[PDB]
Write a protein that binds this ligand. Structure first.
Ligand code: COB
Ligand code: COB
Ligand SMILES: CC(C)=CCC/C(C)=C/CC/C(C)=C/CC/C(C)=C/CC/C(C)=C/CC/C(C)=C/CC/C(C)=C/CC1=C(C)C(=O)c2ccccc2C1=O
Ligand SMILES: CC(C)=CCC/C(C)=C/CC/C(C)=C/CC/C(C)=C/CC/C(C)=C/CC/C(C)=C/CC/C(C)=C/CC1=C(C)C(=O)c2ccccc2C1=O
Ligand code: SF4
Ligand code: SF4
Ligand code: SF4
Ligand code: SF4
Lengths: 503, 89, 503, 89
């Protein structure tokens, strides 16, 4: 029922993608001012000591800068350098951050790094990857790479040929079209799939691509990076180069005007997310970004061979959480993430735009938002204290958000500058808000029974308190999660357990 | 699935049937075999079997603190009907 | 116990990779003589009518050639053209071969086609893919592609840097090294993983790469193919260009001498293999080649970041079935395929060579070869009658094999020219020998109980006959599998069932 | 797993216990309650429960013809001990 379940104001505007934490990294204006927080201290709001207020200063000390907080660009570049592997994490001589775990994280992130164009931090329309030419006769790799389309290419050259040859597939109805598309998407690798109508509210108002400049590495190969790594290593500071901006013209860059969207999700490992602060949870997030990039390309090729236009997307063209809600895949939780019934927030969302007319799905309600009004568990577990502690969701206003948040929608506010400051401090994505979620459970009989109890009036509070008390996914407290030894012991068990957790 | 899961589930069902039969036999022996006195015992037996099943499932999921905590809570939730039945007989 | 379980003769020699059906496709000498079969008629051996004796003539008729059988090159090129999508299958107006199913098949084999270098038909050391340069400023794709490394690249440039910086990871023992490598491989996407010592017997004696020549397509883009597609479409015949041959020198092309091998497998969909002749089973085989290419790259990157050399491989450098046996992953069945305990033959095998010293696994025995001496079920279901009908395995001799088979090992003989003739006739891989296998079962309680019963003396025959009688995976007879309607109904149910078969 | 699998497994265990108790009660009523006459009934009950469980599992796996064939075979394998027990009592 209805197009969108949540309340959207009449002042709503499409979000500019270049304003986000990961794209505003490379705007040179973001390097001029220290990073900003909506609340300087959240100690009064939470009643607990604010650990994230000192993150800019610690990051600046890590970068070698004395007397001023780290800037947004500097903080993001510190995180980028630690993740890329050109530096060492602050906890490298600790279980969960060692060279073995870093090697696992690097291996898991490989496809995303080298064939998706590192789309985790966004991308232009089509994705571009630099690849070094090779000589088949002598198997000699050159030194200067070339730019070629990645796994998210928008190449629709053969669709017109398929249509003109008469081989375009005709569906008898939209319902059959949706059924076939969902079955194909599930076969190609998706865990859940839903179809939503093209809603321009969830498309960004400006598409942009990072500007890369060549820098020579000591191995003898020139690598394209959006910042000056050799200058940063030499201590000369952090320098960025800007963005190449594109208007969101579907006909110009994709060739078609969309009329339906295919949204699908891919689950993450349960045993790796449990060790959330460590780089094992980073490895399981890199594997998911690789998998979602691989599946999207297959779906796009399937659609194009059917004779219909397709545009595979990952974290670049629209906002995935509002579209997944509109496609009936779940509900938006307190953390701002899609809470599926089967996986909870353990998933990553990818989308594919198409001009094929499909029967859209309807939004689903199964008790996430009423549970979230009382649990407040992800907020307690944030090491940066980014998530809101307010009881009820509200129609966000410009006063209730920074430049990096889209106001005018009924929801809880998250501070993005704190979640990037803690990733710079840690050197890897943090997933604590996903790990400690009450809906972050495996699919068995007992969790399915408990999901029913989250909507029976008397059993709701019992289920919530029992989730808190039974100790699922480890301690809630961010600090306690480390020096209690839970993360270390969980990493050791992960390495010493031959099999993962499925039941 | 597995080969041990189905056997343990069958054993749990058999144990539930045995406990229900024992409760009914006890009620008949004391003479107070009314339906409510048997529904209370059924609730106690159900909660005890739920405790055991949740403990096994938590062991399968490598969540070891849930095994004892669920044991305690569901065991108390089972003991309350048992206490009521005993006080009524 | 022991290095290899099966008996290897003292006359054994390493197999030349260019002699196989898919590699000998592109040898110009293979276009001079009609394709050859070990037995012209197998009607006497099987007691049933030989349907595969007419395959060369039918393929030649499909190619437009009158009066002579199709050649090995011509037959292989006809399958290649039907699989690539430049032609139409003989059954396109039938359920299971329609444009929808072809679109699904094309979407599933997308990553293998465009980023693995189409490694299903072999490849050289490192894999090379042609990609069209793109202009990031205008999203303008050029017309002439460039050659860049694929998902199976052997680029080991940073290993020496990691070793010289002192960050190479040191294991306390080989057992811990094997444990960590297996856990990492399972996390990165593998379903089963085993470690075997480097055995030169299972490495090919010659590495080769097909020669590609540019041909212009009507869309305006030049595409590199190993055969002349425009000439073939015009009716001028089939032309190939040869191979670029490399000696198997590990130090020259990889940089290291191997000392251990990581072997892993990835399962295939149960519901799609059931429709084995149709292109749905082809789609589930293309998805598996995509997945195995994606996982191998991650494993290689993990090994290289640990500071050790790595060479990811798919269907190109060694023989996977004997190597997986050495790693303790299963047993070789009557079909010549690895029969794992969990999946049976529903899997694809990939390997990664490394110089890291790992504790090797031991071969396992759980009753496959004794079941195969009596079942003879895959032989009955071969539409080309390629699989041997002999009761016992034997030490194969030059008289018992063609040029395309490696003799001197204790096993059953398979005819490869018949299995390629039927793929040319069908237009897609056939998987019938995998679908009808008694070990091709989903992992549940009843199938584990039956697996226990395949090694109890009295229960063995009962389990075998009950597997045959209960109708698992549809009819055994290849012809009956189609006109009885089983394949059509199974495809319709597959399209009309929202969820796949997992229990 | 699921929510129906565990319920059906517990129900099958309860049914097996009920059949065993009925067999023992029948033997005691006829007076021939020896252990072999009870082990034969146990084998019959086991094979009947195996038939039902295999039918359910085959229904789950979308292998529908195996449901009837398994019923026939395991039902005969269960009927043989039942026939022996009846002829001996
Ligand atoms: C429009 C504006 C910026 N939104 C964006 O542009 C999101 C960009 C992007 C690529 C996401 C991919 C994408 N294409 O969407 C992604 N991230 Co990032 N992320 C970030 C970036 C935020 C930048 C920002 N300005 O918010 C961060 C560094 C903070 C970031 C960090 C995380 N990220 C994470 C994840 C997983 C995700 N992140 C997402 C949201 C996404 C969808 C990525 C993906 N996968 O495709 C993940 C969500 C998966 C899911 N389960 O739903 C995570 C947990 C860290 C990790 N393990 O990797 C952490 C989550 C913290 C958090 N709870 O926010 C980024 C860059 C992204 O929204 P916002 O600032 O109000 O955030 C807001 C959030 C509210 O808190 O819900 C929002 N929303 C928007 N419209 C509507 C709503 C919400 C409701 C209720 C509506 C009715 C409508 C929207 O998601
Ligand atoms: C040495 C000689 C050439 N062997 C090779 O070079 C293998 C080549 C390659 C790439 C395989 C990948 C790889 N890197 O190995 C592959 N194919 Co091709 N294939 C073929 C090619 C034949 C190659 C040939 N002319 O012999 C065919 C078109 C016939 C072919 C067809 C199939 N292929 C198929 C598959 C799945 C495989 N094929 C394999 C064997 C492999 C391993 C590919 C992969 N995956 O990575 C698949 C096996 C998976 C598994 N479960 O083990 C399949 C089923 C079609 C499909 N589903 O798409 C079909 C199987 C038919 C069959 N039973 O042969 C090819 C090209 C390959 O082998 P052979 O003729 O003796 O075959 C023989 C086979 C027994 O007949 O096992 C043998 N073997 C070798 N050493 C030892 C043994 C056996 C025993 C018992 C020993 C003790 C030692 C060896 O495999
Ligand atoms: C009788 C029902 C009884 C009250 C069930 C309570 C069990 C306890 C442990 C609930 C814990 C609990 C579990 C186990 C979930 O799987 C879950 C999934 C999604 C949302 C919430 C929850 C949740 O609160
Ligand atoms: C009591 C044991 C009883 C004889 C079990 C027989 C069941 C029948 C249906 C066996 C069929 C059968 C099944 C069901 C398998 O899963 C399987 C897997 C691997 C190899 C063989 C088999 C097999 O023969
Ligand atoms: S990922 Fe989640 S828990 Fe971690 S800092 Fe960001 S918002 Fe907080
Ligand atoms: S931890 Fe609690 S409040 Fe936060 S997203 Fe999960 S259920 Fe909602
Ligand atoms: S794939 Fe197997 S069944 Fe099919 S033709 Fe080849 S050998 Fe025969
Ligand atoms: S069908 Fe039978 S003989 Fe053939 S590989 Fe399978 S078990 Fe062995």
């Amino acid at each position: 029922t209805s197009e969108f379940p949540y309340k959207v104001d009449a002042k709503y505007q499409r979000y500019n993608s270049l304003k986000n934490f990961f794209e505003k990294t490379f705007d040179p204006e973001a390097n001029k001012t220290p990073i900003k927080f909506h609340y300087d201290d959240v100690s009064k709001i939470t009643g607990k000591k604010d650990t994230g207020k000192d993150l800019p200063t610690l990051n600046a000390e890590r970068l070698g800068i004395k007397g001023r907080p780290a800037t947004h660009t500097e903080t993001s570049i510190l995180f980028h350098t630690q993740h890329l592997g050109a530096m060492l994490t602050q906890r490298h001589n600790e279980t969960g951050w060692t060279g073995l775990d870093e090697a696992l994280n690097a291996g898991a992130w490989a496809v995303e790094f080298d064939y998706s164009g590192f789309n985790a931090t966004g991308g232009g329309p089509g994705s571009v990857i630099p690849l070094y030419p090779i000589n088949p006769m002598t198997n000699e790799i050159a030194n200067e790479p070339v730019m070629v389309p990645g796994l998210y290419n928008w190449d629709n050259i053969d669709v017109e040929s398929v249509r003109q040859q008469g081989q375009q597939w005709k569906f008898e109805s939209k319902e059959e079209a949706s059924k076939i598309v969902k079955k194909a998407t599930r076969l190609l690798g998706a865990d859940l799939v839903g179809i939503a109508p093209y809603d321009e509210r969830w498309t960004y108002s400006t598409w942009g691509r990072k500007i890369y400049k060549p820098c020579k590495m000591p191995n003898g190969r020139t690598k394209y990076l959006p910042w000056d790594l050799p200058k940063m290593l030499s201590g000369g500071g952090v320098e960025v180069f800007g963005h190449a901006k594109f208007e969101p013209d579907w006909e110009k860059y994709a060739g078609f005007k969309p009329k339906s969207v295919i949204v699908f999700v891919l689950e993450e490992d349960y045993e790796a997310i449990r060790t959330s602060p460590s780089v094992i949870s980073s490895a399981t997030v890199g594997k998911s970004y690789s998998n979602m990039a691989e599946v999207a390309y297959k779906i796009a090729v399937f659609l194009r061979k059917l004779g219909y236009y397709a545009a595979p997307c990952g974290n670049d063209t629209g906002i995935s959480v509002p579209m997944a809600v509109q496609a009936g895949l779940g509900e938006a939780g307190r953390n701002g993430l899609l809470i599926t019934q089967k996986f909870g927030p353990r998933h990553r969302i990818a989308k594919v735009y198409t001009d094929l007319e499909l029967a859209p799905d309807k939004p689903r309600k199964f008790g996430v938002r009423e549970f979230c009004r009382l649990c407040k568990k992800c907020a307690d577990a944030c090491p940066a204290q980014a998530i809101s502690h307010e009881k009820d969701p509200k129609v966000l206003q410009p006063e209730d958000c920074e430049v990096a948040e889209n106001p005018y929608t009924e929801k809880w506010h998250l501070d993005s500058n704190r979640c990037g400051s803690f990733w710079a401090y840690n050197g890897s994505p943090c997933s604590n808000c996903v790990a400690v979620c009450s809906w972050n459970k495996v699919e068995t009989w007992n969790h399915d029974v408990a999901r029913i109890a989250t909507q029976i009036p008397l059993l709701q509070d019992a289920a919530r308190k029992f989730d808190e008390w039974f100790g699922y996914n480890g301690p809630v407290n961010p600090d306690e999660r480390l020096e209690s030894g839970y993360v270390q012991n969980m990493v050791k068990d992960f390495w010493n357990n031959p099999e993962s957790i499925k039941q | 699935m597995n080969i041990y899961d189905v056997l343990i589930w069958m054993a749990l069902g058999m144990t539930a049937l045995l406990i229900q039969y024992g409760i009914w036999r006890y009620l008949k022996g004391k003479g107070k075999d009314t339906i409510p006195l048997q529904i209370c015992g059924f609730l106690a037996n159900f909660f005890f079997i739920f405790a055991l099943a949740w403990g096994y499932s938590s062991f399968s999921e490598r969540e070891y603190q849930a095994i004892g905590m669920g044991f305690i809570f569901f065991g108390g939730t089972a003991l309350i009907p048992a206490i009521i039945t005993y006080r009524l007989a």
